[PDB]
Amino acid sequence: MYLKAVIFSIADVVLPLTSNTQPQELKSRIDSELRKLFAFLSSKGIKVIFLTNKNRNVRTHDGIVTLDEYLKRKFPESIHFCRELDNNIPAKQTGKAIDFIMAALELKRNEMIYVGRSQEDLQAATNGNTLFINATWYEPVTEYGFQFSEPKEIARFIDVFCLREQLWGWQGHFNEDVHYYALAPFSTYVPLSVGSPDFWIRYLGASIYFSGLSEGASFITTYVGHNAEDPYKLANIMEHDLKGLAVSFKGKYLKDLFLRHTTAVNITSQINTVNLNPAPIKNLITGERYTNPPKLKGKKILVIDDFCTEGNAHETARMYLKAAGANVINISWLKTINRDVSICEPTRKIRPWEANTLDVDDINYVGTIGYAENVTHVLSEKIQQYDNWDWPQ
């Protein structure tokens, strides 16, 4: 119900462009795997679209053909929007080609995703605010993650994360500025070991995008561990993939927006040990840091953490980001079952870019986002299905 069409670009996706010397076995393999992918999408009622600029000629064993008759011969269950053949199609890098497809097929923006590799296609999808699916089977990418190394991975992403009705296992709201989402419920019997980076970034990407949560998001960030001596264990493992998801949302990932200045249950323990970094890394390739604090006023920011139990961590993140004027979304991989989230607001003013020390009495507990009333009416099974996924019959 969420995904209704997949747009495919050509360059280094359907046909290798950058390098004419791809292994000859590879191109035939990719052609075979792409037929499986398109038949899979057809099997689910999902439309296959090719979006191209030129009806270029394609060297074949039999001779040269046009791109149109190449695609219709090799992948007949398809819709070819070729700008050279139809002046009504706008230039793709402006993102307006997305709006065209939306109207032509009567589809919403986030009922579509965009498979591509070239920077031109990355622009076309992100300028169109459509989720980018970076295909890297012909041309590798080393700068960031959230990649799809072969067509099968796109089918795995769709089947596992994009077809179910329930994108969030738990979600709740309070006032107008408190918004909590969690992918799956969690329960344990003790006081990456669950899943894998690619599993969690793909889970996040799908649920965030198809629920509509990514609309207007400017920033993605993670929280900090309790240990001042090692506060970025999660961010460090997830950095590569979060960089890629931010590129795909056309947002910016701030790895070190939160500082744990002291090692850290009353929520004061979190508030009194963290603050916003006035100079986080602006250029994750260089390590170049902001010259002035990031402008968070009026900006939507997605705060990602692994576990949400009673909300002490997320509420501290929200408190600091709210004090700096941001609009905050609190997202979690896992929500502990039968534990309520206590929502808090500070009585005294917060200095968000430096350390604060609040009393117990400086906390106003204003409400609760209970568990049983916010569950969407299994993680074990989802990881197994993803880890063991293969083409169906």
Ligand SMILES: [Cl-]
């Ligand atoms: Cl093209």
